[PDB]
Symmetry: D3
Subunit: 304 residues, 6 copies
């Protein structure tokens, strides 16, 4: 009944999921033509099957998005009973408002695209905005790394009981204040005027920077600077989604980060070799369980 398919060569996360469910990933022929067009074809009958497509990681987002849409379609016109897009890291999630410009609302495009391509359900993790669930008309199950982060903090930061959870920017206030609350410790916040202002006490205490995403690590590196200048004992950076493109990896080592935690919503094995302070939290049991429960009609809200 249930059938798990993967996206790009990124096959690690989808393989870890298929394991926890006692399945083999479905057979698919997936490639690019010489002239850049994505070519996919399902290697088995999916008729009347509850079908999961776990988004791929070969960096190239437009390539990954299209191959996702093509698989979702492939499956829909081949009479799969239901198709869930499993997108730990929601593409274009940061382009969710105009922001006073004549810019597009790209997350609403992507959302539309996933739906018209035929997705019946979405399973994602830590949406850059909670209102992105409102971009769809189909059910979205938005998972949190929150508990997996807390566990780690407690289990890895000796002084956590008197640490400060700091946000990279002004928009992150809500996310850090919740983590500050569950732990019962101080929060603070940074804001690029440039010059970086910090509000809240971080003197003589551990300072964990929490952000949902890192991309160039420009803001997150600087943030760590400023946190030293304001006399934080040590500075950690916890990012649910670790994208680390461009100069990121070298900017990280170069910074004072005691460590930089990520989830494996994005493949990290390559960047680890080039960065020793990186550590991963496995999110495959969280996605596997959300798949098993989405299938069975059992609750998912627990995992939250």
């Amino acid at each position: 009944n249930i059938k798990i398919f993967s996206g790009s060569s990124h096959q690690d996360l989808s393989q870890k999921i298929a394991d926890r469910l006692g399945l083999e990933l479905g057979k698919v022929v997936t490639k690019k033509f010489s002239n850049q067009e994505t070519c996919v074809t399902i290697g088995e009958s999916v008729r009347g099957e509850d079908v999961y497509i776990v988004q791929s990681g070969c960096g190239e987002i437009n390539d990954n998005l299209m191959e996702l849409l093509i698989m979702i379609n492939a499956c829909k016109i081949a009479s799969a009973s239901r198709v869930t897009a499993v997108i730990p890291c929601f593409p274009y999630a940061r382009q969710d408002k105009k922001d006073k410009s004549r810019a597009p609302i790209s997350a609403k495009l992507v959302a539309n695209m996933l739906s018209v391509a035929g997705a019946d359900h979405i399973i994602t993790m830590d949406l850059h905005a909670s209102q992105i669930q409102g971009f769809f008309d189909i059910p979205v199950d938005n998972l949190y790394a929150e508990p997996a982060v807390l566990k780690w903090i407690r289990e890895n930061i000796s002084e956590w009981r008197n640490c400060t959870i700091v946000s990279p920017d002004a928009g992150g206030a809500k996310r850090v204040t919740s983590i500050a609350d569950r732990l019962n410790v101080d929060f603070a916040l940074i804001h690029k005027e440039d010059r970086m202002v910090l509000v809240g006490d971080v003197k003589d205490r551990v300072a964990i920077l929490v952000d949902d995403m890192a991309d160039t690590c420009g803001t997150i590196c600087h943030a760590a600077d400023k946190l030293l200048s304001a006399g934080a004992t040590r500075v950690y950076a916890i990012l649910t989604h670790g994208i680390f493109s461009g100069p990121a990896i070298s900017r990280i080592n170069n910074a004072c980060f005691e460590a930089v935690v990520v989830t494996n919503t994005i493949p990290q094995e390559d960047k680890m070799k080039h960065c020793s302070k990186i550590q991963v939290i496995d999110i495959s049991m969280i996605l596997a369980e959300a798949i098993r429960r989405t299938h069975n009609g059992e609750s998912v809200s627990y995992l939250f």
Copy 2:
């Protein structure tokens, strides 16, 4: 080509918007039936016209919403060329997300109902979350009162060069900072750690502190923020809200609270609330709205109003 209609009988804002465009409100026979059903009937041809329906400030939100939808539907099947909803205060806006709960995204529902009833355009003001623009597939012009607020501050708060722009919650951070940076002043941020206390970040000592939020309902939060701000060395406290809801004990909570003044736009009618509250000052947003309609209809840039008070 242009035609403006009001909802209900809270017609002040409607009529001011119409005055400023040189127009009379369109004729509407609108009443509530014995069983609470709303009735509407366009007292005039709207065939091939560019129609605007302005959302009423009566108070009863579900009544008010049904009426808006009904007039939209009324005009569409009457062959209006285009129907715009002018909803200065967006209903169910504070309901834009699931919040770890098994709860509706009421705003996306309302978004949806506005769409199917036949709206082509929306013109709203200071959406509780910008992301609500993504709840539609039609265009949305989301206006800001920021410019007006800045103008109000500059011209009424002597110390505005040395003040502190404050968020009464964690969600409102970008909004304050954005004003802070423009006036080239400091910002502070109040977080409440529920049961049942509030924590302040950012220096407010010996400064004037201005509470800025997008909307104030019962005013339980802001009153407690006026106290915490004073406790932390604030010379005095201002509260500026774009949407003046002031339901339940709000008016009481305000007359008691240590606010120097509470300012609100007229996105929701205040005239009555003022009579019981001498702290309340009112920014007139009909010049913003009218101009937005005027531009919408002509094909002129509305973006001009995002930073520049007409």
Copy 3:
């Protein structure tokens, strides 16, 4: 699998339904904020469940309609298998045509609204117009009170065998002539020119006024007048939907109605205390059975 939720505090009808099916109504937190906004949240997992929301009665129709739409939505994005709106009394059912004006077709609005909010199916009773079923694209099961009315007439009106079933207005012709037929007795009809014209024989015989709805009872009171003037022995008024707002209750006692039957599609317990000629027909076994059969794939057309 099946789950019944209620609307407003009106909890009597939905409780009667849940009983006949051997269920407890689902847990929900339903209220109004100080500033009039409806706030609902489902108190249990509805994932993969056939979900019934029985419309509420706290008079205020826009309040009741919205809380209905919000529950239908709540349920849809929480991955309920199917959501049926159970609306004995269809809101705005009288606003189903323009009627030569620039008026809205409100029943088509509401219909659209129920569908976009996510209803998969509608179970209703005595639609003010049969063509309101054509306002949807989803299945509608429209139930009749017809048989429950006939039974009552026969069982309560000694002279029924030679009575006359009269209509309040010209539009009711079809509904009364069917009831006149099943019983094999005379029909007649009234029409406000005002002055009220009556066509058809009512001299020396019982005269039962049948209408689908009563609101102020202005037309129905007058109708009874005229029926006396034309020498009806006694005058009954049978209304499937008893709304009785405004002066209705006092207009009723004040009138010669031997009695005024209603169904309990609307709560009547409060108006009964203020009106002794009122009697109710319980429609909960009809709605309960339509729910059980809609669930099971068994026929509903019988109940008709």
Copy 4:
């Protein structure tokens, strides 16, 4: 900007409507293939034009319907600015409800097919049920022949001040009463209690009786109503129908029936049926239709025609 096209070759009404607007029918190459498939091909640019397709009275309803849809689809993908269907007689209208049965709502289906094929507007006449306007989400201008009927009565029936306007069924009650009240005359109502008799309510004694229905198909009902009316003391009987279908034995049933006259609009072509039937008189509804198109295109009030024969 305006362009009018006809369906099939029943082009009288089409051509009269075009004459009255000062236009020639657009060029259409329309034929039926060997296997019964319909072909259409717009013999001219319609790019950015305000197109009207008038529904043909050929007779074969499914043929006729497909053709209408095809021309609509043909014009839409050809970038017509707007496509209006002018369907004087709405197909499958008598199929607007389920009627306690497991039957289709064919009218809502047709409604749906008209929509997806790309119609933006409908202009129809005397919908069997007004509620069919709720089968669309696009605008519908539903025209009445009432005004014309009133005008026909006044000027041809000497006793119209003392007559009785009759419904041949229970469904047609509002329609008669509405005419009754306007002419300030009495109304009667015939109900048939199937097997197999008819029952009359309302005095018709020593009065002229006018049967008014929206459409007459085989005329089995109306003929039996002419007899029952005469039986109940009617001086004489008129039958007025907005849609003259007259299929099967209708023409026979009519020449035999005790009608003084049978009147019908030309919403469906009668010229041929007339030759075999000298009782048939024909109200010309092309001035109504043309005016409705003319207003539609200009942005003028169509409602003017609901009570006032142009």
Copy 5:
């Protein structure tokens, strides 16, 4: 669970299907009113049933199309679980492109119509164009007569091993070259300049004309001429869909066709009496099996 309904009186094909599945065709009342309107009503409860409507054959295509749409609708608002339109011969399939004119794309109209009327799935045979599957958003299972044709050719044409599969027009190139390939024999092609040009060798060998459709048989008759002129030993004509309207039947006998094969996607029993060279291939086991497999969640792609 499964329920098969038929279209017009054409009841042979649908009866053959219902047999192979061990079912009786569903009860339906289907007629035309005196004024040409199609009147249908389902004679049984279809609630929660997987419903198949096998398109009818009473020649009149607009009549057949509408009665199809009406049945699909009837079923949808009566709460059938799923409705599959079974359309061996897709109506208006030749009107699938503009072709440089301001002509409609009728196959896209019909496709839209089937979908809005409520079809969830389509089972068809030899679509005039494969891209007609792209006219829908619902699954389409397009079956081939290809294998049934090959079998017949091999089993009926002694010299087939050295025969030539010829196409009537230039557009048929793809269809004939595939049949030429599976058999490993020559193909050729004809094209009306009129004067008919033939490309490819047909001298001294059997020449089978393959087309998806025949209508007047004007092109197919002429084609056979030309094939004689170019010295084909014998000429067969294989048409998946045999419509044969107008002068066709007389044009066929009058031509040199050794024989003219068809499928029974259209009723042929009447034209056989008037044409002895006609032979039919039964496609009912192919449609019956596609129905049984579409129901069961078992593969259909095999049949291909």
Copy 6:
């Protein structure tokens, strides 16, 4: 009213189309983020304008597609009166059918994505299958390079009166014949019977042979067709393609192949490929595209361009 925007920075075709209409390309801030996400931001009001977005020839199809969609979406919510996609070469066109496989109809998907992102019109050139026009419900103007190709042949191939127009595959038959008939010359057709040989039908002996296909990607097919054609007595071989893709070893395969010349339109930028390939000649299709936009906007017949090179 009219406004033209380019995608990416492959702005030659865009700029030529704009030059020919007397317009400057609209202002666009378009860049790729660090994580490969595309950004777009319309540097100017498009409110109530008739906008055209021209598809870029960068190369990376999924990048290019996302960008197009994004600009479409960007303009729609910015209240553009109408948004047209001008996609000289339609992405995923060769993916229009299932081909007996469990494969996507990528073209119908792309069709769908173009629709939901908010396109009102498409203007494309030589769709791989005409049937792709049926993947939309909006209008599509599908242009032909046939006229230009005919004009190129007539004026560069001396023997064009005696030549043979060839299809490199079975699918391309109608396309060649259509050119064959117009020039009143013969046609031939190459079929490949995969593993691994090609079979020719139609006399090419002692004639000039012109390979005509709609697109050429790696050129593996056409090179092998140049050889087979020469083998079968062709004086010499021309290859004409409307869409010059030339990826992978194409440029190599071409310099080696016995083509007298390879011709392509500039639907995809060739300037760079030319420098490495002296066989490549380039038909300029911006006069066709501009004219198509010019007509689209005015309401003039585009069909004029289907047979007549402006």
